[PDB]
Write a protein that binds this ligand. Structure first.
Ligand SMILES: *[C@@H]1O[C@H](CO[C@@H]2O[C@@H](C)[C@@H](O)[C@@H](O)[C@@H]2O)[C@@H](O[C@@H]2O[C@H](CO)[C@@H](O[C@@H]3O[C@H](CO[C@H]4O[C@H](CO)[C@@H](O)[C@H](O)[C@@H]4O)[C@@H](O)[C@H](O)[C@@H]3O)[C@H](O)[C@H]2NC(C)=O)[C@H](O)[C@H]1NC(C)=O
Ligand code: PIO
Ligand code: PIO
Ligand code: PLC
Ligand code: PLC
Ligand SMILES: *[C@@H]1O[C@H](CO[C@@H]2O[C@@H](C)[C@@H](O)[C@@H](O)[C@@H]2O)[C@@H](O[C@@H]2O[C@H](CO)[C@@H](O)[C@H](O)[C@H]2NC(C)=O)[C@H](O)[C@H]1NC(C)=O
Ligand code: CL
Lengths: 510, 459
């Protein structure tokens, strides 16, 4: 599949030919209650990150893009990906890297006095052109260069960003509402409290901690040895939704204290009507968009493409791993083109660009599998999940009751659980464990301990450089510095290390 | 005189004695209106530890307060409050009767009751104490939330002498946060003790001092928060009683404010019997001669009640032959002296919130559950039989017979809880020892000998 045919659009046409004949089979292959249960699993698996990321983005962007835009974008793009995608199992949704880039671009626009929502439109135009070119000359083969080194650095950095953002937002909540001897009660809160309030900071902290604790405990219960087993797994799958429900109820029955809630408009309306409308005028909303930025918003498009490409193609090669028995065709070229073109069109509409995310796609595959006898592949479950996510915006009364601290707890849970599968995290943990306790894994046995620690130290240096670039005003360059790790692994590490050490420390498929 | 290793062990033993002493002292001071509190408990522990080190036959045994003693003290305080009696004077008379019981039992041979107490009663007792600890922690949290509810508006100038006269902001939520954090840190350091991280020596050292470290962490957290009120330990400045407005050091047996009823001077024999049963059960579950140490503990507790000081129990073991005996003597003496001198640390103790001690209370309650086969079978109640461990009472006993055994034990626990709730709470030790005839008579009727040998094992 990832072979340079040498013909224009060769990969895309090959994938579309591969997957077209199966269409009716996918439509009529669901025909069962297994799909009706996978729909319920993935609806929540997609809604929880959707609302968390929408809340964070609405807070940072001042609701230029928020929960409503994210929900509608996820729904519509999921419908399109279900009808047209080469791999319907892949679930398109806002991810951590996309949020990081969006924060960076919003900060850049604020510093440069530009309209963020219009710079995004121009970035979308450039992304469409870029993907047309990249798919013309097969560039999906570049995913081969993306080694475990860069994937691990990327995932670890995103998890660290999630954790730090959660705790920084909690610190901000405390700063806004400090623990005081006395409060000027009767403060006005039309948009938000104009002064410190009692019990707000501590209650938000308690809500966050409780949501995190309940999610973690249900995760542990999923893998426990309690209850009839099938029910144990059913409850474990519904862990994050149950924790959200529990903490939302706990907050709901405490009526006197104030905690900030999700900002959701009543119906299908933008989060901030005054700031923007449904359609974004490319030339400008309130003021002229600078000409130089129209041409200069191609490096940001390249960085966004780098992020989406890395995430989506890693997901595609994870799902297409032959161990999972992914019968039928999975197309890198078509998936990437569809995802990023839909993202650019959304950017025109003011809605976020999405990327095929690893966790939710893998969970969908696991839900739709049978025993490993086979995997039930359909485009009906994804379509129903997408339409349910779209209708979720209609449920404003429920959503407006959700505290933001609960979503911060879910954010922290997401980061901590994403930390699990990374071998960089395992080696960082081994930095503390004595050598006598080092597991029996290829890189522990076939590499001297101090050389393993040197490898992990170089990875940590790369992480520190990436974080410094995140904090500096040149935040947008972070994807480029991340891609710089590929040359580091393919050029410098061979000088620093021998081939067997790099084989063990960077093995793909383990 | 003292080797560096002796000091190293003395620090661990001293902190292990001080943490429960402070927690129980704070709880008892809160319950008893400070008629008995942290100062009285500390001085009692110090003096009785000195005496038990010098005279006790088994020096490796550590004598201090305990959960059952706290339960009995609360029950007796409630009884006295209901019947309008002076709690401290009633304690004095209970101590008199305990001394009389000690001399009577010394006259007789004794040792016939020990062979009867089996794992059945020990496990029921331990599980009940753990449940009481957890329930009391949560109930005290609820009480704090009732005292300082979360409301939109608060009164600006509520009076803070002696304690807040009205609700305060951030008090309930901060107390909840402090207790939860103390519990979490103690649990995390307990896990870190049995982990693979860090060098072994440092890991074990940090695990040993997990409870003190968590207390210190949360005390600092609360100390740097200055504008929020949290209730603190009521510790007097010096070797003094908690509230001198209520009592002095030596208690007059005939009364302090009112005259102690004549009938109670005799009815205090039954509470003395119950105290003896409780202390004996504790010493039996701990040690497993013992008779001399148990009677010394009971006599010292009886003499201590004359001064309003709590009576203690022989908790459990602490962490050529003459050399080891003398070393244990010296270690016990040093630990007792340090516990006594720790009441001069009022500056530090007065800054410890009661919420931190509630977190430590919950930590003790939860940790005591480990190692109790009753808890293990209660957990097996909730697993399918395929995951049941490889233990003698799982392989050689049918699953439903084991479940019936555990259910009978749960019925015993429920009866104990009901008795503890009713105004008959003082009889709880007697109802506790009533599980001995149940094991010895009815269980054979309803169970086969092999099933009882496996489920209720000596070791
Ligand atoms: C140290 O001890 C004092 C005094 O304790 C009293 O004396 C000892 C010997 C025992 O007999 C105790 O039972 C006695 O209470 C404690 O002061 C007490 O505080 C409690 C809790 O705040 C008070 O309980 C309230 O009392 C009210 C009924 O009492 C009526 O009579 C008294 C005396 O005239 C009067 O002060 C009061 O206003 C009433 O008229 C009532 O509001 C309510 O139900 C509640 O029970 C108790 O009254 C106090 N005692 C006295 C004598 O004032 C201290 O609390 C303790 N120290 C600490 C740190 O706890
Ligand atoms: C506070 C910072 C630490 C200060 C101290 C500075 C840190 C420091 O000095 O570590 C040296 C240690 C080397 O000691 P070393 O490996 O030879 O000792 C092994 C093990 O660490 C334990 O000492 C023992 O296991 P156990 O547990 O007893 O069963 C065992 O000895 P024993 O079985 O034969 O008796 C040995 O297998 O290296 C690390 O463990 C990694 C620590 C990484 C973290 C270091 C972070 C600096
Ligand atoms: C909420 C109500 C839930 C109880 C509903 C009542 C439902 C009920 O009565 O279940 C009986 C169950 C025994 O289940 P049972 O032995 O028939 O089935 C075993 C096991 O439970 C799993 O089904 C499988 O293990 P795994 O995990 O897949 O590896 C395995 O099947 P498989 O390997 O051959 O495929 C079996 O070995 O006993 C309890 O655990 C209940 C604990 C008390 C429940 C306490 C509830 C508070
Ligand atoms: C398990 C431990 C629980 C600890 C609970 C929190 C105790 C400290 C609260 C002080 C609040 C205060 O005083 O808020 C005020 C202070 C600062 O002062 P300021 O004048 O507002 O400065 C800012 C002036 N602005 C408002 C103009 C910008 O804010 C802080 O520095 C907040 C730091 C505390 C963050 C708590 C997060 C802890 C998470 C731990 C993992 C679950
Ligand atoms: C670690 C988990 C344990 C948590 C238990 C906390 C005890 C709460 C007590 C409620 C009953 C009560 O007395 O509430 C008090 C009032 C009830 O208001 P009212 O009906 O007008 O009565 C007015 C007062 N009364 C009852 C004296 C008449 O409101 C509150 O302050 C409720 C705040 C509850 C917040 C608890 C946060 C839970 C976090 C869980 C995630 C870990
Ligand atoms: C909704 O948007 C308003 C207005 O946003 C401004 O106009 C947009 C078209 C775009 O150019 C934005 O960058 C502008 O800020 C927000 O009101 C602003 O709030 C900020 C933050 O406090 C304040 O400094 C500005 O003065 C406000 N500007 C105006 C014109 O009122 C408002 O906060 C947004 N609402 C929500 C709920 O996020
Ligand atoms: Cl995601």
């Amino acid at each position: 599949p990832l072979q340079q045919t040498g013909q224009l659009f060769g990969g895309l046409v090959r994938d579309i030919r591969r997957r077209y004949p199966y269409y009716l089979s996918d439509i009529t292959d669901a025909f069962s209650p297994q799909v009706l249960a996978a729909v319920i699993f993935i609806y929540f698996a997609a809604l929880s990150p959707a609302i968390t990321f929408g809340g964070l983005l609405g807070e940072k962007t001042r609701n230029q893009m928020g929960v409503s835009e994210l929900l509608i974008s996820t729904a519509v793009q999921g419908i399109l990906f279900a009808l047209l995608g080469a791999q319907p199992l892949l679930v398109v949704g806002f991810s951590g890297p996309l949020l990081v880039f969006e924060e960076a671009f919003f900060s850049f626009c604020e510093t440069n006095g530009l309209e963020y929502i219009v710079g995004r439109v121009w970035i979308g135009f450039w992304l469409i052109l870029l993907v047309v070119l990249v798919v013309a000359f097969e560039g999906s083969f570049l995913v081969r260069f993306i080694s475990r080194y860069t994937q691990e650095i990327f995932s670890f950095l995103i998890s660290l960003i999630f954790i730090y953002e959660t705790f920084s937002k909690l610190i901000k909540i405390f700063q806004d509402h400090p623990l005081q001897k006395t409060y000027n009660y009767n403060v006005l809160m039309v948009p938000k409290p104009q002064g410190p309030l009692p019990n707000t900071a501590l209650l938000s902290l308690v809500l966050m901690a409780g949501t995190f604790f309940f999610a973690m405990m249900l995760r542990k219960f999923k893998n426990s040895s309690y209850f009839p087993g099938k029910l144990r797994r059913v409850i474990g799958d519904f862990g994050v939704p149950i924790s959200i429900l529990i903490m939302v109820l706990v907050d709901f029955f405490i009526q006197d204290t104030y905690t900030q809630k999700l900002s959701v408009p009543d119906g299908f309306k933008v989060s901030n009507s005054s700031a923007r409308g449904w359609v974004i005028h490319p030339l400008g909303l309130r003021s002229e968009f600078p000409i130089w930025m129209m041409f200069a918003s191609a490096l940001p498009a390249l960085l966004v493409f780098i992020l989406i490409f890395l995430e989506s193609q890693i997901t595609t090669l994870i799902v297409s791993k032959p161990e999972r028995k992914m019968v039928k065709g999975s197309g890198f070229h078509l998936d990437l083109l569809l995802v990023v073109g839909m993202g650019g069109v959304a950017a025109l509409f003011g809605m976020p660009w999405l990327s095929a995310t690893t966790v939710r796609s893998v969970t969908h595959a696991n839900a739709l599998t049978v025993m490993i006898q086979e995997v039930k592949e359909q485009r009906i479950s994804g379509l129903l999940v997408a339409v349910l996510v779209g209708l979720s915006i209609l449920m404003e009364p429920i959503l407006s009751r959700i505290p933001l601290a609960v979503l911060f707890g879910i954010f922290l849970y997401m980061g901590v659980t994403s930390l699990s599968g990374i071998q960089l995290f395992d080696r960082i943990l081994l930095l503390f464990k004595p050598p006598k306790y080092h597991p029996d894994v290829p890189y522990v046995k076939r590499v001297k301990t101090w050389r393993m620690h040197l490898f992990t130290g170089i990875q940590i240096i790369c992480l520190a450089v990436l974080w410094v670039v995140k904090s500096t005003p040149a935040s947008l360059a972070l994807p480029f510095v991340l891609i710089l790790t590929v040359p580091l692994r393919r050029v410098l590490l061979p000088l620093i290390f021998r081939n067997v050490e790099l084989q063990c420390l960077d093995a793909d498929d383990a």
